[PDB]
Design a protein around this motif. Structure first.
Motif, PDB file in Angstrom:
ATOM      1  N   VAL B   1      12.902  27.278   2.843  1.00 25.25           N
ATOM      2  CA  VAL B   1      13.203  25.876   2.570  1.00 25.25           C
ATOM      3  C   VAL B   1      12.138  24.957   3.180  1.00 25.25           C
ATOM      4  O   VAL B   1      11.661  25.193   4.295  1.00 25.25           O
ATOM      5  N   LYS B   2      11.754  23.925   2.432  1.00 28.11           N
ATOM      6  CA  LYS B   2      10.773  22.958   2.907  1.00 28.11           C
ATOM      7  C   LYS B   2      11.345  21.548   2.848  1.00 28.11           C
ATOM      8  O   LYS B   2      12.128  21.223   1.957  1.00 28.11           O
ATOM      9  N   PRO B   3      10.957  20.697   3.805  1.00 22.89           N
ATOM     10  CA  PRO B   3      11.463  19.327   3.778  1.00 22.89           C
ATOM     11  C   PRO B   3      10.730  18.542   2.702  1.00 22.89           C
ATOM     12  O   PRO B   3       9.720  19.007   2.172  1.00 22.89           O
ATOM     13  N   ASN B   4      11.240  17.370   2.357  1.00 23.57           N
ATOM     14  CA  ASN B   4      10.466  16.494   1.493  1.00 23.57           C
ATOM     15  C   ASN B   4      10.364  15.097   2.056  1.00 23.57           C
ATOM     16  O   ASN B   4      11.005  14.157   1.569  1.00 23.57           O
ATOM     17  N   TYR B   5       9.552  14.966   3.096  1.00 20.21           N
ATOM     18  CA  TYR B   5       9.295  13.662   3.665  1.00 20.21           C
ATOM     19  C   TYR B   5       8.505  12.811   2.686  1.00 20.21           C
ATOM     20  O   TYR B   5       7.513  13.258   2.107  1.00 20.21           O
ATOM     21  N   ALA B   6       8.987  11.594   2.478  1.00 18.57           N
ATOM     22  CA  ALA B   6       8.336  10.659   1.579  1.00 18.57           C
ATOM     23  C   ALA B   6       8.184   9.337   2.304  1.00 18.57           C
ATOM     24  O   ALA B   6       9.061   8.939   3.072  1.00 18.57           O
ATOM     25  N   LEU B   7       7.072   8.657   2.056  1.00 12.68           N
ATOM     26  CA  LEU B   7       6.792   7.395   2.727  1.00 12.68           C
ATOM     27  C   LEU B   7       7.785   6.310   2.317  1.00 12.68           C
ATOM     28  O   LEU B   7       7.979   6.055   1.120  1.00 12.68           O
ATOM     29  N   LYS B   8       8.404   5.672   3.307  1.00 11.25           N
ATOM     30  CA  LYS B   8       9.368   4.602   3.044  1.00 11.25           C
ATOM     31  C   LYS B   8       8.883   3.229   3.491  1.00 11.25           C
ATOM     32  O   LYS B   8       9.078   2.241   2.781  1.00 11.25           O
ATOM     33  N   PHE B   9       8.273   3.154   4.674  1.00 15.39           N
ATOM     34  CA  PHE B   9       7.799   1.872   5.191  1.00 15.39           C
ATOM     35  C   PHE B   9       6.469   2.020   5.900  1.00 15.39           C
ATOM     36  O   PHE B   9       6.188   3.066   6.491  1.00 15.39           O
ATOM     37  N   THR B  10       5.661   0.970   5.837  1.00 15.69           N
ATOM     38  CA  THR B  10       4.434   0.881   6.613  1.00 15.69           C
ATOM     39  C   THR B  10       4.527  -0.353   7.512  1.00 15.69           C
ATOM     40  O   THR B  10       4.845  -1.458   7.035  1.00 15.69           O
ATOM     41  N   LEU B  11       4.273  -0.161   8.805  1.00 15.54           N
ATOM     42  CA  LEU B  11       4.516  -1.189   9.819  1.00 15.54           C
ATOM     43  C   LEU B  11       3.190  -1.716  10.357  1.00 15.54           C
ATOM     44  O   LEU B  11       2.464  -1.009  11.057  1.00 15.54           O
ATOM     45  N   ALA B  12       2.881  -2.967  10.038  1.00 16.79           N
ATOM     46  CA  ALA B  12       1.638  -3.592  10.469  1.00 16.79           C
ATOM     47  C   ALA B  12       1.924  -4.628  11.535  1.00 16.79           C
ATOM     48  O   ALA B  12       2.944  -5.307  11.495  1.00 16.79           O
ATOM     49  N   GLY B  13       1.031  -4.750  12.506  1.00 18.82           N
ATOM     50  CA  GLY B  13       1.217  -5.754  13.527  1.00 18.82           C
ATOM     51  C   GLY B  13       0.304  -5.557  14.711  1.00 18.82           C
ATOM     52  O   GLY B  13      -0.184  -6.527  15.292  1.00 18.82           O
ATOM     53  N   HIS B  14       0.064  -4.307  15.089  1.00 14.16           N
ATOM     54  CA  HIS B  14      -0.860  -4.081  16.184  1.00 14.16           C
ATOM     55  C   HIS B  14      -2.284  -4.431  15.769  1.00 14.16           C
ATOM     56  O   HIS B  14      -2.676  -4.227  14.615  1.00 14.16           O
ATOM     57  N   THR B  15      -3.048  -4.975  16.708  1.00 15.97           N
ATOM     58  CA  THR B  15      -4.384  -5.461  16.388  1.00 15.97           C
ATOM     59  C   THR B  15      -5.489  -4.511  16.824  1.00 15.97           C
ATOM     60  O   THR B  15      -6.672  -4.788  16.617  1.00 15.97           O
ATOM     61  N   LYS B  16      -5.107  -3.402  17.454  1.00 13.86           N
ATOM     62  CA  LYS B  16      -6.044  -2.339  17.795  1.00 13.86           C
ATOM     63  C   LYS B  16      -5.333  -1.029  17.520  1.00 13.86           C
ATOM     64  O   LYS B  16      -4.189  -1.033  17.064  1.00 13.86           O
ATOM     65  N   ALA B  17      -5.996   0.089  17.807  1.00 18.59           N
ATOM     66  CA  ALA B  17      -5.389   1.405  17.630  1.00 18.59           C
ATOM     67  C   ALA B  17      -3.984   1.472  18.211  1.00 18.59           C
ATOM     68  O   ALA B  17      -3.726   0.960  19.309  1.00 18.59           O
ATOM     69  N   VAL B  18      -3.082   2.130  17.490  1.00 23.27           N
ATOM     70  CA  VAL B  18      -1.762   2.426  18.018  1.00 23.27           C
ATOM     71  C   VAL B  18      -1.940   3.689  18.846  1.00 23.27           C
ATOM     72  O   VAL B  18      -2.724   4.563  18.464  1.00 23.27           O
ATOM     73  N   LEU B  38      -0.133  -4.333  23.990  1.00 25.44           N
ATOM     74  CA  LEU B  38       1.216  -4.742  23.636  1.00 25.44           C
ATOM     75  C   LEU B  38       2.117  -3.554  23.328  1.00 25.44           C
ATOM     76  O   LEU B  38       1.657  -2.484  22.897  1.00 25.44           O
ATOM     77  N   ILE B  39       3.406  -3.758  23.576  1.00 28.90           N
ATOM     78  CA  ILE B  39       4.461  -2.897  23.073  1.00 28.90           C
ATOM     79  C   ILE B  39       5.172  -3.653  21.959  1.00 28.90           C
ATOM     80  O   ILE B  39       5.434  -4.853  22.093  1.00 28.90           O
ATOM     81  N   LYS B  40       5.434  -2.984  20.841  1.00 30.24           N
ATOM     82  CA  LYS B  40       6.237  -3.590  19.788  1.00 30.24           C
ATOM     83  C   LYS B  40       7.494  -2.781  19.524  1.00 30.24           C
ATOM     84  O   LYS B  40       7.486  -1.546  19.650  1.00 30.24           O
ATOM     85  N   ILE B  41       8.574  -3.479  19.188  1.00 30.11           N
ATOM     86  CA  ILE B  41       9.855  -2.864  18.870  1.00 30.11           C
ATOM     87  C   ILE B  41      10.130  -3.111  17.394  1.00 30.11           C
ATOM     88  O   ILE B  41       9.950  -4.239  16.909  1.00 30.11           O
ATOM     89  N   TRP B  42      10.564  -2.067  16.692  1.00 28.29           N
ATOM     90  CA  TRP B  42      10.850  -2.124  15.259  1.00 28.29           C
ATOM     91  C   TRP B  42      12.204  -1.479  14.957  1.00 28.29           C
ATOM     92  O   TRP B  42      12.618  -0.537  15.636  1.00 28.29           O
ATOM     93  N   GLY B  43      12.881  -1.951  13.915  1.00 25.80           N
ATOM     94  CA  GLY B  43      14.084  -1.282  13.445  1.00 25.80           C
ATOM     95  C   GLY B  43      13.781   0.134  12.968  1.00 25.80           C
ATOM     96  O   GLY B  43      12.863   0.364  12.180  1.00 25.80           O
ATOM     97  N   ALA B  44      14.561   1.093  13.444  1.00 24.86           N
ATOM     98  CA  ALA B  44      14.260   2.497  13.169  1.00 24.86           C
ATOM     99  C   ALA B  44      14.505   2.889  11.717  1.00 24.86           C
ATOM    100  O   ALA B  44      13.877   3.822  11.212  1.00 24.86           O
ATOM    101  N   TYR B  45      15.426   2.191  11.055  1.00 28.22           N
ATOM    102  CA  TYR B  45      15.844   2.568   9.708  1.00 28.22           C
ATOM    103  C   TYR B  45      15.153   1.757   8.621  1.00 28.22           C
ATOM    104  O   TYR B  45      14.962   2.248   7.508  1.00 28.22           O
ATOM    105  N   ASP B  46      14.787   0.519   8.942  1.00 22.42           N
ATOM    106  CA  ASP B  46      14.190  -0.377   7.953  1.00 22.42           C
ATOM    107  C   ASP B  46      12.757  -0.776   8.291  1.00 22.42           C
ATOM    108  O   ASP B  46      12.081  -1.426   7.491  1.00 22.42           O
ATOM    109  N   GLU B 283      18.731  11.097  12.033  1.00 24.37           N
ATOM    110  CA  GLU B 283      18.336  11.092  10.629  1.00 24.37           C
ATOM    111  C   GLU B 283      17.011  11.824  10.446  1.00 24.37           C
ATOM    112  O   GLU B 283      16.212  11.905  11.387  1.00 24.37           O
ATOM    113  N   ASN B 284      16.779  12.370   9.252  1.00 26.46           N
ATOM    114  CA  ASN B 284      15.501  13.015   8.951  1.00 26.46           C
ATOM    115  C   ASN B 284      14.428  11.963   8.712  1.00 26.46           C
ATOM    116  O   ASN B 284      14.044  11.696   7.570  1.00 26.46           O
ATOM    117  N   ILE B 285      13.961  11.353   9.800  1.00 26.78           N
ATOM    118  CA  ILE B 285      12.953  10.309   9.726  1.00 26.78           C
ATOM    119  C   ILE B 285      11.835  10.646  10.708  1.00 26.78           C
ATOM    120  O   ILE B 285      12.098  10.970  11.874  1.00 26.78           O
TER     121      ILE B 285
END
Lengths: 10, 304
Positions: B1-18, B38-46, B283-285
């Protein structure tokens, strides 16, 4: 130059 | 069995390498750290941006959550760690004692202690409440790339550019074990497995290895990716199939079957080295983060 030790690499 | 991870969101905001991404233990949040200080906080699901936490004077190499999801600790080139109250954004304590860049950090499972590793070749153990250093371990002969407590907090594993993984007694500071395989490449990451039996170690010869800690033996090796330069995190994914997950210097996320060691998926999308990945606790995220030419975080979701 990248700003952090980890992002600079070995 | 293989997973099927698919891209859901792209998070932009940091101004240098994460530099690092981590999901909160309660599954609500993703925290990211960056060379942008900086540290940034994002919603894990959205993936929705929540807030920025500021205060370090130089770039940050690592951030980690307390087990109740209320605190963060960050490790900076400014040679400090900072303990943050996430809800208020306040810096509760600044941990001063390392003599060079702080590279890596983690709370113990109780979350009364923090362990840190530094370019000063030491591992320090700090009291969370007082922000005071309890122990300094002369751990390695080169920068310390990772530090992690085991399941009950009684042990710390550390890794270093010196080619060694070492296991330390938290209470006494004694070195209990030194682990190294047949070659001596820099060790760029280590952590205990969720059940505490194993240590997953990355080396800068394009290899991940699963070690049986008690026996001091390498059990499994995971290969196929590129990792010769950066200290790339690796994870155990446990919400669906049992996988090993890691970024790569070919800009992909690699996912292996833990037991069989076969590659089961490669995630394409980033435009620079994937330095950090994290797996959601329920969740499988997967969250992935990339270096300076990219600057984004991506959230991928699977049905397995």
């Amino acid at each position: 130059q990248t700003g952090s030790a980890r992002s600079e690499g070995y | 069995v293989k997973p099927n991870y698919a891209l859901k969101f792209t998070l932009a905001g940091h101004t240098k390498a994460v530099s690092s991404v981590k999901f909160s233990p309660n599954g609500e949040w993703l925290a990211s750290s960056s060379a942008d200080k900086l540290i940034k906080i994002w919603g894990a699901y959205d993936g929705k941006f929540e807030k920025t936490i500021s205060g370090h004077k130089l770039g940050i190499s690592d951030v980690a959550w307390s087990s109740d999801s209320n605190l963060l600790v960050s490790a900076s080139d400014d040679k400090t760690l900072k303990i943050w109250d996430v809800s208020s954004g306040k810096c509760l304590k600044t941990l001063k004692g390392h003599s060079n860049y702080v590279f890596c950090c983690n709370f113990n499972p109780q979350s009364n202690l923090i362990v840190s590793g530094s370019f000063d070749e030491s591992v320090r153990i700090w009291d969370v409440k007082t922000g005071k250093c309890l122990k300094t371990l002369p751990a390695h002969s080169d920068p310390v790339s990772a530090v992690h407590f085991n399941r009950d907090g009684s042990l710390i594993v550390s890794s270093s550019y010196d080619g060694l993984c070492r296991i330390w007694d938290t209470a006494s500071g004694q070195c209990l074990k030194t682990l190294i395989d047949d070659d001596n490449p820099p060790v760029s990451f280590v952590k205990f497995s969720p059940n505490g039996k194993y240590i997953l170690a990355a080396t800068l010869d394009n290899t991940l290895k699963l070690w049986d800690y008690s026996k001091g033996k390498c059990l499994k090796t995971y290969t196929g990716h590129k990792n010769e330069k950066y200290c790339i995190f690796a994870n155990f994914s446990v919400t669906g199939g049992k996988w090993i997950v890691s970024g790569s210097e070919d800009n992909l996320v690699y996912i292996w079957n833990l037991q069989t060691k076969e590659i089961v998926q490669k995630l394409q999308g980033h435009t620079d080295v994937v330095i950090s990945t994290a797996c959601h606790p329920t969740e499988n995220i997967i969250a992935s983060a990339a270096l300076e030419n990219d600057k984004t975080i991506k959230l991928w979701k699977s049905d397995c």
